[PDB]
Design a protein around this ligand. Structure first.
Ligand code: NAP
Ligand code: NAP
Lengths: 354, 354
């Protein structure tokens, strides 16, 4: 019954470390077969998300295949048993593609270091979004990133007023969201930034102390900045970076503390594969480290709560949830490259509109 | 008015690594003032414990002072407000000494890496003991070690039937305790031994698989031995060893897994301070690692419970809890040295009768 011309960003080359987007990615035109299966449905991408964790998926993506990504899609056309009818807005791992055909079921990430099943698509009810909480928040504070932050702070971390909370890679959306909730629950918040621009930005949001991780290239010099910024010890660590800062924070864990390992920038991107053993430090404090893989929380009730609980605070200016929306499908890898650029140009989540 | 001659083992020299007990320790004669205060007590040591963690306390024990140690002591004489009357059996950190004076109160370990409060002495009620669970069990299955194992299995680890539980340093008393409770909870249990003597000992008691960590000083054959022993992945890791075995186990953590870090022989004893970054492996499996410091559990309700839950199983021959009782105060470091001996002639908990 027909086909259609579509643009895709495919994985051209595997490069370790801080990526070179123009070298890694290639826009191709690709003929998309439009004869939908029993439960398949033809989707139009409206927004794609650009995220640092994609640095890993790219290395596990077969050369020539399209680049995965959280996206917002519209149902152009749907097969007889599809989960959504034409017109429905949906969220899922659509990728850097203009159009795609999918049955919307949980697919498995076969070529992955860890076998992973991507979540089945979720429908968006447009009634939830307006100019203070736009639809693009479904890829940020009302989607993947917000669910990560909200999930950790309500289902794992119990922040007592007086606790000192350290957030690494704080300047991004998950770290700023986490820290602000910690400020709200009565915590001293310590964050980490890479420039003065981000450092004063995190200050506004209410971070009591911000450490320049680039100035503290050393793990000892990072341990001193940490000793003074958190004079009474760390009670909660929300870790996105790893490397020498987690080595530093783990040397100062209070009793009963809780670490949340969310990502490890320092090992994925900058390849800090060997370092001091951190496990000895957790024995006396009875510290609980927990890995975060927020997909587990992608359920209907959770999405409901995330809107009511968190969404209110965002629209009432009680919680800042910034976003930087470039425009144009052609500029997606450009937009992605900014995540590794030292410029102070990012606030919150980065999205592309198509 | 009153004094008493008492022998004490004092710390002559600090030596790092596998200890040289004959070189580190020294039997001295010590005149003990027996004129007790109104709430003090003169105590006689009946049994002393030798434990691999003493290697750490010995290095933090100021030169010339007595070597700390868990002991079982009897009240020779007590002031009018003492917490215990004469004849009473108590358990506490009496040390490698024949006689001592104490208020039985929580002493603080100033000279420690982490400020640590030694627990106040606990009274031993002889009704609790019999010919299958003798008085010496208060330093083993009915004391510190048993509280560690039972504490972790009842207050942290939830072993579901089918899980594969890996216990490192299994041949000792905490490790054998932990494995048998996982075996009883429906787990395939994997342990680690250094000789066929230890491994076949672990074979009896019910370990489905035993790994020769000495054959695999390298992590490559260690990750292979684990792949074979745990073909379906690790769900529960009870870690006493650390080092390249924990490196191997972290590469095969299933979803929802739980590590319990209890000690790190390879870092304390063998100085394995550096290794592969393990926190990256805990993200996707949503693993919860937790540090163990069983002092937190030394409360009366817990002690009642340890006798009820654990003590019953031992008395009903459902749980083997072996112990190796050296005799003679003169031999305390001799008995201590066997813990670090490359020969594996010791089974269960090691005590001296004095
Ligand atoms: N586990 C999950 O389910 C899950 C879900 C979504 C995302 N994630 C991952 O978790 C991370 C947290 O999200 P996010 O929004 O907070 O991302 P993010 O802040 O953009 O993460 C990178 C930030 O960390 C800082 N940084 C970069 N390199 C660094 C280094 N070498 N040392 C110290 N700090 C460095 C940078 O701060 P400056 O701006 O100051 O340079 C940068 O803004 C993301 O990277 C994402 O990939 C995990
Ligand atoms: N966190 C706490 O509060 C707490 C409380 C009490 C005790 N602990 C610690 O927990 C440990 C376990 O208690 P336990 O009484 O059952 O002691 P343990 O098992 O005797 O501890 C060491 C055991 O591991 C094995 N081992 C020795 N060297 C090894 C190596 N290089 N690699 C791998 N395995 C090795 C030994 O068996 P082989 O004969 O096979 O060498 C030995 O039986 C103790 O060592 C103690 O220090 C912690």
């Amino acid at each position: 019954l027909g086909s259609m011309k579509t643009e895709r960003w495919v994985v051209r080359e595997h490069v370790e470390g801080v990526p070179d987007a123009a070298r890694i990615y290639e826009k191709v035109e690709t003929e998309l077969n439009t004869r939908l299966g029993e439960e398949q449905m033809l989707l139009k991408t409206l927004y794609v998300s650009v995220d640092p964790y994609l640095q890993g998926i790219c290395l596990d993506t077969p050369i020539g295949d399209h680049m995965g990504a959280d996206s917002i899609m519209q149902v152009l056309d749907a097969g007889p048993n599809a989960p959504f009818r034409p017109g429905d807005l949906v969220q899922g791992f659509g990728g850097w593609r203009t159009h795609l055909v999918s049955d919307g079921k949980p697919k498995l990430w076969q070529t992955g270091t860890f076998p992973m099943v991507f979540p089945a698509y979720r429908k968006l009810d447009l009634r939830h979004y307006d100019d203070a909480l736009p639809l693009s928040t479904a890829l940020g504070v009302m989607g993947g990133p917000g669910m990560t932050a909200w999930g950790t702070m309500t289902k794992f971390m119990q922040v007592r007023p007086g606790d000192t909370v350290v957030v690494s890679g704080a300047s991004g959306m998950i770290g700023t969201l986490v820290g602000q909730m910690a400020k709200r629950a009565g915590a001293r918040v310590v964050g980490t930034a890479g420039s003065a621009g981000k450092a004063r930005y995190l200050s506004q949001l209410g971070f009591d102390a911000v450490i320049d991780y680039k100035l503290a290239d050393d793990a000892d010099k990072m341990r001193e900045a940490l000793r003074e910024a958190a004079p009474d010890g760390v009670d909660k660590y929300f870790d996105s970076i790893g490397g020498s800062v987690t080595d530093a924070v783990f040397s100062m864990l209070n009793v009963g503390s809780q670490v949340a390992v969310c990502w490890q920038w320092a090992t994925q991107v900058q390849r800090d594969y060997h370092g001091p053993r951190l496990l000895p430090y957790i024995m006396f404090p009875r510290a609980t480290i927990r890995g975060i893989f927020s997909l587990e929380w992608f359920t209907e009730q959770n999405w409901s709560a995330l809107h009511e609980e968190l969404g209110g605070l965002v629209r009432r200016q009680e919680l800042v949830a910034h976003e930087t929306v470039q425009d144009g499908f052609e500029h997606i890898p450009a937009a992605y490259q900014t995540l590794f650029s030292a410029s102070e140009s990012n606030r919150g989540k980065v999205l592309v509109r198509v």
